[PDB]
């Protein structure tokens, strides 16, 4: 381990071995000094115009962190295509992480003149929250992950966290965490860091779409032996009185047939069209938003439980806050136009999951008698019911991979709503920080903590290797399947490539459900 010796090589590749695929990606990173080496209490109350739904109390820290919770951090577009076009499923098995070729640079600023040089003896500090003692900030769809394109140099995100709050104030249970309290490895140029991790057992992601629907599992050609109430009143003319008539469900009465299952849970969202002219002329994104109520404040149930984005022929419709939406390259942070973002679609699950913008179904609302007509009620919120079956939200090339399951007494189907794998012991948080280097101190002793430091930052490479287990497709479907494919005809540029300006871009969201499977 010396100044003149590399401490690691560039490992970027993918190998397919059978029921496994191993991805490996390396990137060059840059880490500045955050918070001026300080920890700062940050808060936001209800003063000014800040609403109560957005209050918070927490801290910003001088630390940065590595994040690769995004599929494109590991799969190239072509690899993603190889995965989704041929496998009914897949899942993470184990990973290796490495930090190397570290270099700490210090910048001198005198008379407009700026010079940067190495500080051969400075160190960075690194450690993993292997015992999950820090607030788990990963799994919240934050920016700062390794770039999709291998040639892009990225900046390391700053670590910050939240605790309990009451307005802009802290409460008795509010917790303060000092990351310097943890043992951490100190590396100088020449030193490297690495660790291994094994994923817990988790189900394969459903990278397939159903080629059958819950309400169409019977034999088209045979009647049931079971009967259903088919008539409640006579029909012979005008002397119509009450009676009781029963019939057997059959090919023409599939909606009446007795069935064994029920569609998945529902939490109805407001519908909105991509054809603005068809929408009400008001600003309802928030006022008509589907939300949950937690201790006084409201949050969008975004994207909320997995529901079909729209029913047959209505591609223009989508749940106001019930789908993942990515931005196109350079889309504005605020009020970006529809043509600057990319809406995803969980259309593939219409097959088992209720459509996100409609009722779950209908229930009786009273007791009918001869003097009281029967009444019905529309169900727009339907929790788990015995016999329900459903699918989870799909995952995307540019979407999240996993999330830490909250440590609670209970929960229900812990599949992270934004999509992905829910893990009790997810990949550990990897914290990194440039060690503060005092600028000359006074010549006579003083109690005060130093606050004058040499200006510096660090850079180096990072590698992440993940082994994935594949669940091969075993279909007897005779006719060809749907497959993700590149466009055929000429185009100004190549999809999933760089610009004349060297800018890489992801033209569209790529899901995972192309192959089909029976129910």
Annotated binding-site members: 415, 422
Q: Is 10 in the site for its own copies (CB under 8 A)?
A: yes
Q: Is 316 in the site for its own copies (CB under 8 A)?
A: no
CB of residue 34 to its own copies, shortest distance in Å: 7
- Contact by Cβ (8 Å): 61, 160: yes
CB of residue 66 to its own copies, shortest distance in Å: 13
What SS3 state is found at 180?
Answer: helix
Which of 169, 212, 366, 486 is in the footprint of Na ion by CB under 5 A?
486
C-alpha–C-alpha distance, residues 307 and 393, integer Å: 8
Q: Which stretch binds its own copies (CB under 8 A): 90-98, 114-122, 194-202, 464-472?
A: 114-122
Look up tokens 């401490």; give the residue: 7
The dihedrals phi and psi of 244, each to the nearest 5 degrees, come to -135, 115
- Residue 407 token pair: 């440590």
Q: Of these partners, its own copies, Na ion, none, which one is at the site of residue 428 (CB under 5 to 8 Å by kind)?
A: none
Taking Cα atoms as reference points, which of 377, 263, 255, 250 lies closest to residue 311?
263
Which of 68, 87, 128, 303 is in the footprint of its own copies by CB under 8 A?
303
Q: Is 175 in the site for Na ion (CB under 5 A)?
A: no
Q: Of these partners, its own copies, Na ion, none, which one is at the site of residue 116 (CB under 5 to 8 Å by kind)?
A: its own copies
Q: Is 329 in the site for its own copies (CB under 8 A)?
A: no
Q: Is 113 in the site for its own copies (CB under 8 A)?
A: yes
CB of residue 307 to its own copies, shortest distance in Å: 10
Q: Rounded to whole angstroms, what are the CA distances from 37 to 31, 246, 400, 431, 435?
A: 12, 78, 30, 14, 8
Q: Which stretch binds Na ion (CB under 5 A): 43-51, 249-257, 345-353, 479-487?
A: 479-487
CB of residue 272 to its own copies, shortest distance in Å: 7
C-alpha–C-alpha distance, residues 510 and 508, integer Å: 6
C-alpha–C-alpha distance, residues 269 and 431, integer Å: 38
**Residue 194 half-sphere exposure, CB side, CA atoms within 13 Å?**
15
Nearer to its own copies, 303 or 428 (CB): 303
Give the H/E segment covering residue 84.
Answer: helix 77-84
Q: Is 473 in the site for its own copies (CB under 8 A)?
A: no
Q: Which residues pair with 423 in a beta bridge?
A: 404
Nearer to its own copies, 94 or 253 (CB): 253
Nearer to its own copies, 201 or 312 (CB): 312
Which of 85, 86, 96, 158 is in the footprint of its own copies by CB under 8 A?
158
Q: Is 42 in the site for its own copies (CB under 8 A)?
A: yes
Total residues binding its own copies (CB under 8 A): 330
Which of 483, 491, 495, 519 is in the footprint of Na ion by CB under 5 A?
495
Which of 17, 18, 47, 115 is in the footprint of its own copies by CB under 8 A?
115
- Apex 493 CA angle, 490 and 498, nearest 5: 155
Q: Of these partners, its own copies, Na ion, none, which one is at the site of residue 15 (CB under 5 to 8 Å by kind)?
A: none
Bind-site residues for AMP: 415, 422
Q: Is 74 in the site for its own copies (CB under 8 A)?
A: no
CA 474, 477, 479, 485 dihedral sign is negative
What SS3 state is found at 270?
Answer: coil
| 233: exposed, middle or buried (Cβ count in 10 Å: 0-12, 13-18, 19+) | exposed
Q: What is the footprint of Na ion within residues 432-451 (CB under 5 A)?
A: none
Give the H/E segment covering residue 81.
Answer: helix 77-84
Q: Is 194 in the site for its own copies (CB under 8 A)?
A: no
Q: Is 483 in the site for Na ion (CB under 5 A)?
A: no
- Contact by Cβ (8 Å): 302, 323: no
Q: Which stretch binds its own copies (CB under 8 A): 90-98, 194-202, 329-337, 464-472?
A: 329-337
Taking Cα atoms as reference points, which of 351, 358, 329 lies closest to residue 270?
358
Q: What is the footprint of its own copies within residues 364-403 (CB under 8 A)?
A: 364-365, 367-377, 379-392, 398, 403
CB of residue 258 to its own copies, shortest distance in Å: 5
C-alpha–C-alpha distance, residues 435 and 187, integer Å: 10
Q: Is 237 in the site for its own copies (CB under 8 A)?
A: no
Radius of gyration, alpha carbons of the chain: 28
Q: What is the footprint of Na ion within residues 81-110 (CB under 5 A)?
A: none
- Contact by Cβ (8 Å): 481, 516: yes
CB of residue 494 to Na ion, shortest distance in Å: 8
Q: Is 201 in the site for its own copies (CB under 8 A)?
A: no
- Contact by Cβ (8 Å): 93, 199: yes
Q: What is the footprint of its own copies within residues 77-96 (CB under 8 A)?
A: none
Window 165-184: contact mask with its own copies (x via CB under 8 A): xxx-xxxxxxxxxx-xxxxx
Q: Of these partners, Na ion, its own copies, none, which one is at the site of residue 202 (CB under 5 to 8 Å by kind)?
A: none
Query: Which residues in 105-132 are b (16+ Cβ under 10 Å) and which e?
Result: bbeeeeeeeeeeeebeebbbbbbbbeee
- Residue 518 token pair: 């029976």
C-alpha–C-alpha distance, residues 479 and 174, integer Å: 60
Nearer to its own copies, 196 or 280 (CB): 280
Q: Which stretch binds Na ion (CB under 5 A): 144-152, 336-344, 360-368, 483-491?
A: 483-491
Interacting residues toward Na ion by CB under 5 A: 486, 495
């Amino acid at each position: 381990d010396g100044v003149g010796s590399s401490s690691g090589n560039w490992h970027c590749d993918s190998t397919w071995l059978g029921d496994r695929v191993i991805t490996t990606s390396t990137r060059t990173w840059a880490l500045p000094t955050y918070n001026n080496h300080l920890y700062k209490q940050i808060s936001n109350g209800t003063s000014g115009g800040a609403t109560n739904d957005n209050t918070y109390f927490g801290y910003s820290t001088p630390w940065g962190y590595f994040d690769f919770n995004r599929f494109h951090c590991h799969f190239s577009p072509r690899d993603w295509q190889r995965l989704i076009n041929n496998n009914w499923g897949f899942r993470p098995k184990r990973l290796s992480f490495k930090l190397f070729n570290i270099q700490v640079k210090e910048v001198t600023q005198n008379e407009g003149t700026k010079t940067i040089a190495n500080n051969l003896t400075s160190t960075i500090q690194v450690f993993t929250d292997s015992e999950y003692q820090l607030p788990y900030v990963l799994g919240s769809a934050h920016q700062g992950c390794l770039p999709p394109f291998p040639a892009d140099v990225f900046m390391i995100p700053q670590y910050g966290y939240l605790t309990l709050n009451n307005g802009s104030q802290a409460v008795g249970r509010s917790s303060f965490y000092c990351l310097e309290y943890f043992p951490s490895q100190m590396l100088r140029t020449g030193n490297n860091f690495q660790f291994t991790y094994t994923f817990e057992d988790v189900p394969f992601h459903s990278s397939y779409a159903h080629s059958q629907s819950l309400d169409r599992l019977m034999n088209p050609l045979i009647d049931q032996y079971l009967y259903y109430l088919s008539r409640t009143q006579t029909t012979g003319g005008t002397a119509n009185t009450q009676t009781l008539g029963f019939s057997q469900g059959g090919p023409n009465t599939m909606a009446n047939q007795a069935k064994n299952w029920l569609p998945g849970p529902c939490y109805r969202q407001q519908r909105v069209s991509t054809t603005t002219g068809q929408n009400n002329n008001s600003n309802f994104a928030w006022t008509a938003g589907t939300k949950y109520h937690l201790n006084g404040r409201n949050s969008l149930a975004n994207p909320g439980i997995a529901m079909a984005t729209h029913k047959d022929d209505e591609e223009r419709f989508f749940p106001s806050n019930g789908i993942l939406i990515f931005g196109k390259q350079n889309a504005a942070r605020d009020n970006a136009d529809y043509s600057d973002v990319m809406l995803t679609s969980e259309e593939e699950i219409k097959t088992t999951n209720p459509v996100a913008t409609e009722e779950y179904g209908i229930v009786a609302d009273n007791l009918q008698q001869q003097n009281t007509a029967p009444q019905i009620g529309t169900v727009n919120s339907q929790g788990a019911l015995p016999g329900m079956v459903w699918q989870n939200r799909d995952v995307y090339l540019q979407g999240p991979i996993w999330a830490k399951i909250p440590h609670t007494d209970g929960n229900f189907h812990p599949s992270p709503l934004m999509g992905g794998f829910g893990l009790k012991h997810p990949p550990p948080q990897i914290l990194i920080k440039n060690t503060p280097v005092p600028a000359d101190p006074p010549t006579t002793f003083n109690q005060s903590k130093l606050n004058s430091f040499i200006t510096q930052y660090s850079t180096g490479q990072v590698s992440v290797e993940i082994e994935w287990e594949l669940q091969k497709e075993n279909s007897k479907r005779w006719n060809p399947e749907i497959q993700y494919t590149s466009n055929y005809y000429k185009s100004t540029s190549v999809d999933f490539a760089v610009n004349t300006e060297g800018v890489y871009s992801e033209p569209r969201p790529i899901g995972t459900r192309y192959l089909t499977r029976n129910l």
